[PDB]
């Protein structure tokens, strides 16, 4: 079952906004941090340096949170949870939790196939 009709999806960016000077020191995780120095280059927006995350980078409100197929992710844990998607076949998609036994995993996929709900993390 394909998803509903929707406008095309535009991303506006794909890089990840790395942190300044994280390629030179090993004690610096790559999560972005605001440079608050007196005479910092990135804070002053010189030419030819890393960019900074603004609010003009946000995505369209009609196509926000949709994976490239058209659905929105929904985390499930048991068989009673996949039953909440009875009325949403063309908008949401299930995702099996990482701490579920293997027997529960196969049980859920059977019920989902009946309901016509797309499952992403389905073991081959």
């Amino acid at each position: 079952v394909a998803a509903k009709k929707h406008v095309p999806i535009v991303k506006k960016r794909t890089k990840r906004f790395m942190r300044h000077q994280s390629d030179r020191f090993k004690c610096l995780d790559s999560a972005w941090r605001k440079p608050k120095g007196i005479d910092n280059r990135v804070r002053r927006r010189f030419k030819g340096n890393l960019a900074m995350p603004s609010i003009g980078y946000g995505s369209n409100k009609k196509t926000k949170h949709m994976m490239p197929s058209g659905h929105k992710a929904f985390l499930v844990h048991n068989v009673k949870d996949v039953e909440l998607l009875l009325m949403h076949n063309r908008t949401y998609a299930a995702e099996i939790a990482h701490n579920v036994s293997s027997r529960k995993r196969i049980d859920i996929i059977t019920r989902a196939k009946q309901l016509g709900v797309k499952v992403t993390n389905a073991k081959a």
């Binding site: 949170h65 929105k72 992710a73 929904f74 985390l75 009673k80 909440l84 009875l86 009325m87 949401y92 196939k113 009946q114 309901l115 016509g116 081959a124």
Partner: protein
Amino acid sequence: SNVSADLIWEVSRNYNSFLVKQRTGTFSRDALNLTNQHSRKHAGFVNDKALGIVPAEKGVKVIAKKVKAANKPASSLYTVTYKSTARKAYKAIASQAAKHGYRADLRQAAVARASAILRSQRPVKPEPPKKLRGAAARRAA
């Protein structure tokens, strides 16, 4: 008096034990809630008149609330099981909803939920086996 459907919604508009909130939308796990959304229009346990549909062993089972016996839950639910035909069930449900003014706005939703349950009660079709493309073509060789 000091109690009413509107007041109950004010107390439970923020948190209740039937609510399931996470990113990308919120849902509700009620028996008397069609479409399983969280809204005043669909919250069955607050309105004075609601509908609910549950899959039976062969058909559907439709349940409604009796506005007079509200303070006695043992007998406050009108239940009927439809197990004859899809079209006849559709007609009975729609007439039960929008003929005497009992929530004439849930007509379209009640019919659609019945369609889903009957649609799922069919025997499934087998999936066609997957293909492998470039990655496993080398490995298969």
